[PDB]
């Protein structure tokens with residue numbers, strides 16, 4: 001009965017039949033990065049994945065630039081008001097482009113699971129934190145419902161902003177993968193964390209408009225609450241990160 | 255428990271409800287049980303109680319008590335030397351430090367008196383006022399403030415109490431005026447301005463407590479309270495935005 005409200009446009013798309021295939025994948029991911037992986041790496045030397053990391057980070061930067069451009073050309077730069085933007089459920093070329101860009105953003109969350117696989121294989125267990133695993137699990141898991149029910153409108157603003165910030169974030173990760181010699185020039189590490197914090201604030205301020213807009217016909221109000229609560233959860237997790245990494249100096253720039 | 259209680263503030267040891275978190279957990283368990291289950295069941299086959307005079311007296315008392323607690327928070331540090339940045343707890347037995355610890359305990363105790371709001375809802379059969387937002391707030395605020403009085407009764411952790419007592423002067427004046435009757439409720443056109451004040455309060459509390467995460471060399475003794483205050487101010491901001499949405503944007507509880 002609940003699946004009768006799903007967008008029929010995404011029915012045949014990869015992983016969109018039911019939430020079960022992604023729950024199995026993410027269950028195996030959580031099991032691997034927190035339990036199986038570190039156990040298998042315990043009596044092994046770390047893997048040398050410098051070239052794999054550099055190629056991966058470069059691909060994510062270009063893929064994020066592409067998804068940002070597609071979100072701009074699917075609505076955000078061609079008519080969206082930045083207030084009550086509703087989903088367009090028609091089979092028009094522009095409405096399908098916005099739906100497919102949401103699907104692409106969702107799929108990119110599964111590719112970004114490789115971040116945690118690199119941490120495990122490189123034996124960087126200090127980077128497998130609650131903040132990282134929680135974010136990398138709940139972002140794709142919840143975005144399945146966004147692609148399935150509301151692939152467009154005001155619910156995609158945080159994705160437009162996130163793909164633009166992930167261009168800076170994975171350029172930092174790409175530059176840091178070059179080695180300890182190149183990490184000394186990444187003095188602006190704290191400015192990237194500030195950008196991520198400012199991103200959650202802007203996402204919360206944008207989605208908060210939903211609660212005040214009379215006659216807003218955005219079709220799935222529950223996503224305003226999810227977006228608002230998740231941006232608060234990440235703002236708290238990233239403020240705890242800022243506190244131990246910089247205020248307490250556990251992960252200062254090199 | 256015995257090792258964790260070795261960090262408790264000995265100044266508050268003998269104070270009412272401060273021996274252990276157990277007496278307040280029993281009281282709040284009975285309150286949650288009463289307002290969500292027992293009370294409404296007993297009122298189901300009864301006429302509502304006429305508590306107009308009891309409500310007016312209670313709201314008037316809470317307004318004066320909030321003015322008093324606000325004044326005491328101002329005279330215990332906020333208006334006499336607190337920087338509004340890294341204000342550490344003063345654990346000495348100096349007159350100002352004890353006055354701050356006293357005011358925190360009074361604020362904590364006032365949360366138990368405020369449980370009467372929900373009792374008034376149940377007895378008046380206003381079950382639409384017994385919402386998740388109300389019961390959760392009224393349960394979590396006193397329950398958690400026991401730990402604040404017990405371990406850190408002062409400093410930057412009390413800013414939200416200074417602000418909250420000042421807003422509760424406006425909020426219970428609204429409740430007091432609406433208790434006068436349907437004739438007086440028509441002049442309470444500013445209901446949405448009070449909800450805006452409550453929302454702006456959570457924003458200011460979050461902005462103030464966020465300083466903790468960035469201040470180097472801040473010697474505030476219980477960092478865990480910075481996380482609790484920030485998370486609670488986010489939880490209430492979300493609950494009050496959902497309230498604004500159904501009460502005003504969808505018109506379920508518009509001013510009269």
Ligand SMILES: *[C@H](CCCCCCCCCCCCCCC)CC(=O)[C@@H](*)C(=O)SCCNC(=O)CCNC(=O)[C@H](O)C(C)(C)COP(=O)(O)OP(=O)(O)OC[C@H]1O[C@@H](n2cnc3c(N)ncnc32)[C@H](O)[C@@H]1OP(=O)(O)O
Nearest residue numbers: 115118119132142146155173176177193223227230231251
């Ligand atoms: C999160 C999304 C938020 C969304 C907004 C809220 C609303 C959501 C609603 C969802 C539901 C909607 C429903 C639908 C409605 C329609 C952001 C996001 O998407 C991507 C992110 O990655 S954010 C999380 C990542 N962060 C962390 O893991 C840790 C937190 N720290 C930071 O983010 C920092 O600010 C910083 C980016 C600077 C990283 O700091 P650090 O943790 O301290 O890291 P290091 O400086 O050590 O990193 C250098 C080391 O990492 C190695 N390296 C390089 N490349 C990689 C890769 N790709 N993987 C792993 N490791 C890598 C370097 O080699 C170096 O290690 P070495 O040992 O050589 O020193």
Ligand SMILES: *[C@H](CCCCCCCCCCCCCCC)CC(=O)[C@@H](*)C(=O)SCCNC(=O)CCNC(=O)[C@H](O)C(C)(C)COP(=O)(O)OP(=O)(O)OC[C@H]1O[C@@H](n2cnc3c(N)ncnc32)[C@H](O)[C@@H]1OP(=O)(O)O
Nearest residue numbers: 371374375388398402411414429432433449483486487507
């Ligand atoms: C919460 C605290 C925030 C703290 C900051 C965050 C961080 C905290 C960290 C804690 C941990 C720290 C650890 C230690 C550190 C060292 C706020 C607070 O303290 C007090 C409050 O009361 S806030 C919540 C109350 N609100 C609600 O219940 C519902 C939400 N709505 C609102 O708030 C509204 O903005 C408004 C105030 C306008 C009320 O709206 P409404 O719910 O729509 O109400 P009505 O207009 O219907 O009410 C009128 C009816 O109520 C009757 N009435 C009058 N007086 C009373 C009383 N006292 N009790 C019950 N009923 C009453 C009137 O007669 C009228 O009914 P009638 O049938 O006659 O028309």
Ligand SMILES: CCCCCCC(CCCCCC)(CO[C@H]1O[C@@H](CO)[C@H](O)[C@@H](O)[C@@H]1O)CO[C@H]1O[C@@H](CO)[C@H](O)[C@@H](O)[C@@H]1O
Nearest residue numbers: 061167168170171172173174175176178182184185186187
């Ligand atoms: C992806 C984001 C980071 C890009 C970094 C750009 C990179 C390094 C390139 C190599 C990167 C490692 C593979 C280009 O910068 C170089 O560009 C040359 C152009 O020919 C200039 O002639 C040279 O002087 C300059 O430093 C450094 O940028 C900055 O460096 C500052 C001094 O720390 C400079 O004050 C600043 O202005 C410059 O912008």
Ligand SMILES: CCCCCCC(CCCCCC)(CO[C@H]1O[C@@H](CO)[C@H](O)[C@@H](O)[C@@H]1O)CO[C@H]1O[C@@H](CO)[C@H](O)[C@@H](O)[C@@H]1O
Nearest residue numbers: 171172174175176177178179180181182183184185186187
């Ligand atoms: C295409 C060739 C690019 C070479 C660029 C070298 C790079 C950046 C490295 C970035 C590494 C990527 C993560 C080293 O830059 C740094 O070098 C340090 C010494 O190690 C200095 O202590 C530091 O202050 C300097 O910024 C920038 O160097 C130059 O930038 C010029 C501004 O046009 C300066 O006028 C120039 O004189 C400086 O030298």
Ligand SMILES: CCCCCCC(CCCCCC)(CO[C@H]1O[C@@H](CO)[C@H](O)[C@@H](O)[C@@H]1O)CO[C@H]1O[C@@H](CO)[C@H](O)[C@@H](O)[C@@H]1O
Nearest residue numbers: 260261262263264265266267268269344345346347348352
């Ligand atoms: C057990 C009785 C006999 C010993 C007396 C100890 C002494 C006085 C010491 C005087 C100086 C001696 C050189 C410590 O007293 C102080 O000690 C401070 C440091 O811990 C506390 O911060 C402070 O609150 C306490 O009053 C008073 O003990 C009691 O005082 C109570 C309040 O009258 C306290 O609530 C109680 O718990 C404490 O047991």
Ligand SMILES: [Cl-]
Nearest residue numbers: 129131240241
């Ligand atoms: Cl962390």
Ligand SMILES: [Cl-]
Nearest residue numbers: 385387496497
């Ligand atoms: Cl509500």
